[PDB]
């Protein structure tokens, strides 16, 4: 009912090697060659990838910046508000960034902020401007 284990004999394959005297070798050569093409093609990318690796050398570690720890304080300095608005203008809704930039506000606070001062900072206007880019 089924080929012995790890013997592969397929209707399709069988017809295929059968079709002419040399068909057998034709198909084996196609693959022999075809495989070689992949092999070579690998080595390109290997080389290509290797070169990219060189460029990337040295990591980014020189360009890292010390982390800053910010206690997520309750109050807004006017400074803090001023940063926020600007943040909005640069950052749309990405409240995470915005909290990140202001550095000591909860992400809630920001949305917290957003509605809260929406009136007097014409945040609509700002937003729309930030939108227009």
């Amino acid at each position: 009912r089924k080929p012995p284990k790890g013997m592969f004999l397929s209707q399709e394959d069988v017809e295929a090697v059968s079709a002419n005297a040399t068909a057998a070798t034709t198909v084996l050569r196609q693959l022999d060659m075809e495989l070689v093409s992949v092999k070579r093609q690998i080595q390109n990318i290997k080389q290509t990838n290797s070169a990219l690796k060189e460029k990337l050398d040295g990591g980014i570690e020189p360009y890292r910046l010390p982390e800053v720890i910010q206690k997520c304080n309750a109050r807004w300095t006017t400074e803090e508000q001023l940063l926020a608005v600007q943040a909005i203008r640069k950052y749309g809704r990405d409240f995470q960034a915005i909290s990140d930039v202001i550095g000591n506000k909860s992400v809630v606070q920001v949305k917290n902020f957003f509605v809260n001062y929406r009136r007097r900072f014409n945040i609509d206007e700002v937003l729309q401007e930030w939108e227009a880019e």
Partner: protein
């Protein structure tokens, strides 16, 4: 099995059912009630048993009856009917037994039997046993035909049949009892030595063998499951199928390698894309850093938009740093996964060159067994007779198989050196025309009621005819003759002053360097009391080797063995014999096989006797006159000694039924 059922089995019959043959003789019974069937069977079985239990003496109806018990001793005709069936058809009181009722005083009918093979011999005894008048005619100066056993000094070696394939249900079993043939089991262990002369590591050995077996079933699979039995209008040989299967296995290997490396590139490519992304990030990061550096130049205390720059720029830069640290993460995995894939290449090849060659030996072996190139074997039918395999280990005849024919021949009218040339059969009877082998011109004519032909298929196949049929055989007969295959296989015999090989081991192989020469001296046997080494030439080699001096042939022989056992060890052989059966005029080969495009049914056609037309037109249909037996006539036991013998028993019964009438079928 054991007991009566053992006897059925040992007689190649189902213990619990009646055979087609029994049906023909006891049509009353088998259309009858089951109960009676059961009785019949037991009687038959019992009767078998008693013969089997002692086969050195005739088993008579009286004796048979004597030992039966009622209910069964109840019906004496049934017993007698059965006992006679068994007797006529050679199921009992066959071979060499002590006759209790000495021979019928005057004989009835006369039969001429062509060939003193085992087929002939067995029929002849059977017939004579039935009171017919029988003469045998043999071209050769000896009996036994293809049971040819060489004797010289205490050297003994069969050039012919050599092996008894199992005693379970084999007639030769009885004959063994009936004759002292010394039987020797054949220890299975056979070790192979590459052309270098180096043994083959147990590892490879088993690996390859198993592939071989693996490969065979495969063929079977194409044959039945994909019905791959015709290609381009012509039937498929087992050889083609093996090639196809092998190719396919090779294809698969390539196929899988491709897929593996393909998995790599894709992974390697996927990484490439990652790097780019990574390189740019570094680009942006680098630059962003500048900008932060610059903006942070503007020393506080600063207006807010300027404070903003620093902060925002700072955030953006850590963002990207985060983003990139991730990629460096990903990249690590990819690098490592590529690292594993180069670890686990799928298999490099289907078979090493060395690998192919051990495999070839296995194929030579198959070729030895079938006595033909697998190119010629029928894919669909080459093993058709596989079901009727005997049981028990194989054996050889330590004293030379010839003892059997010889034994059989004792008591019989045999004319040696008589070569049949023409067989004429007509309604009134037949005349057979023969010559003396020694001087062709001196001529004999034999007249008889029937001729039994045991000429080898090889001989039958000869063009132009070695034997002429008058009238010619019907096309149905002759086509079967063309279609069936007659193989070839040859032995070389080496006799030595001393054993220089392992006595523990019966046989060992040599592995040929070429596929074309897998046949050549591929296997060696030590079976005899003397120091004799026997070497097969099989496959396509057999045919070819036949055109080569014994000395050369022996050359290669010694070579091979020196290599295997070291050059100082291998003495020149005292006595050497080489065979060449396809050459032999009275054989023209070794044994039949199922050629591609034939089938078992051809075997049946060969056994069908021939009925001459009427002498005067519009006279009624005759009796048949010309009968065939021999190894190539028995579809379930072709190509063997037991097969021939069985065929012979068969035809004797058929003939006796015909010329003596069978008084047991009412």
């Amino acid at each position: 099995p054991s007991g009566v059922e053992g006897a059925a089995f040992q007689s190649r019959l189902p213990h619990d059912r009646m055979t087609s043959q029994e049906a023909a003789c006891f049509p009353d019974i088998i259309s009858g009630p089951q109960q009676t069937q059961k009785v019949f069977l037991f009687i038959r079985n019992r009767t078998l048993q008693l013969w089997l239990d002692n086969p050195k003496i005739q088993l008579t109806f009286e004796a048979t009856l004597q030992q039966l018990e009622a209910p069964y001793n109840s019906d004496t005709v049934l017993v007698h009917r059965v006992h006679s069936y068994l007797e006529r058809h050679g199921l009992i009181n066959f071979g060499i037994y002590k006759r209790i009722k000495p021979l019928p005083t005057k004989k009835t009918g006369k039969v001429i039997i062509i060939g003193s093979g085992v087929s002939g011999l067995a029929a002849a005894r059977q017939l004579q046993s039935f009171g017919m008048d029988v003469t045998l005619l043999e071209a050769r100066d000896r009996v036994g035909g293809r049971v040819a056993t060489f004797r010289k000094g205490n050297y003994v070696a069969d050039l012919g049949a050599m092996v008894v394939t199992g005693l379970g249900g084999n007639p030769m079993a009885v004959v063994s009892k009936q004759v002292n043939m010394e039987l020797a089991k054949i220890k299975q262990k056979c070790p192979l030595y590459e052309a270098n002369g180096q043994a083959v590591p147990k590892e490879k050995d088993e690996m390859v063998e198993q592939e071989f077996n693996r490969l065979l079933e495969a063929t079977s699979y194409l044959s039945h499951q994909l019905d791959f039995n015709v290609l381009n209008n012509k039937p498929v040989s087992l050889g083609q199928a093996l090639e196809v299967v092998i190719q396919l296995q090779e294809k698969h290997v390539k196929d899988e390698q491709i897929e593996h490396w393909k998995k790599i590139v894709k992974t390697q490519e996927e990484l490439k894309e990652l790097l780019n992304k990574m390189v740019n990030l570094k680009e942006k990061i680098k630059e962003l850093h500048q900008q932060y550096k610059e903006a942070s130049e503007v020393k506080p205390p600063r207006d807010i938009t300027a404070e903003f720059l620093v902060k925002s720029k700072h955030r953006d830069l850590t963002a990207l740093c985060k983003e990139y640290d991730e990629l460096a993460e990903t990249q690590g995995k990819l690098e490592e996964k590529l690292q594993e894939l180069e670890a686990n290449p799928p298999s490099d090849v289907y078979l090493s060159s060395r690998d192919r060659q051990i495999l070839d030996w296995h194929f030579a072996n198959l070729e030895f067994a079938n006595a033909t190139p697998l190119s010629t074997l029928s894919l669909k039918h080459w093993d058709q007779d596989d079901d009727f395999e005997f049981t028990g280990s194989h054996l050889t005849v330590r004293n030379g198989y010839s003892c059997v024919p010889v034994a059989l021949a004792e008591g019989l009218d045999i004319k040696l050196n008589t070569a049949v040339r023409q067989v004429r059969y007509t309604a009134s009877g037949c005349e057979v025309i023969a010559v003396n082998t020694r001087s062709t011109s001196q001529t004999f004519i034999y007249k008889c009621d029937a001729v039994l032909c045991t000429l080898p298929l090889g001989v039958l196949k000869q063009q132009p005819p070695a034997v002429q049929f008058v009238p010619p055989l019907p096309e149905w007969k002759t086509s079967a003759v063309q279609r069936m295959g007659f193989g070839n296989l040859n032995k070389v015999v080496l006799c030595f002053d001393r054993v220089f090989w392992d006595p523990s081991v019966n046989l060992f192989g040599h592995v040929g360097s070429t596929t074309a020469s897998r046949g050549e001296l591929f296997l060696f046997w030590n079976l005899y009391k003397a120091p004799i080494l026997l070497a097969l030439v099989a496959g396509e080699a057999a045919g070819i080797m036949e055109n080569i001096s014994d000395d050369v042939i022996v050359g290669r022989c010694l070579a091979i063995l020196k290599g295997i056992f070291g050059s100082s060890a291998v003495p020149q052989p005292k006595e050497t014999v080489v065979s060449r059966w396809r050459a032999d005029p009275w054989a023209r080969g070794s044994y039949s096989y199922v050629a591609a495009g034939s089938s078992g049914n051809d075997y049946d056609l060969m056994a069908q006797p021939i009925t001459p037309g009427p002498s005067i037109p519009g006279a009624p249909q005759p009796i048949p006159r010309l009968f065939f037996a021999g190894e190539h006539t028995i579809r379930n036991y072709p190509a063997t000694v037991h097969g021939a013998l069985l065929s012979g028993l068969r035809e004797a019964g058929r003939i006796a039924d015909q010329f003596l009438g069978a008084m047991y079928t009412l």
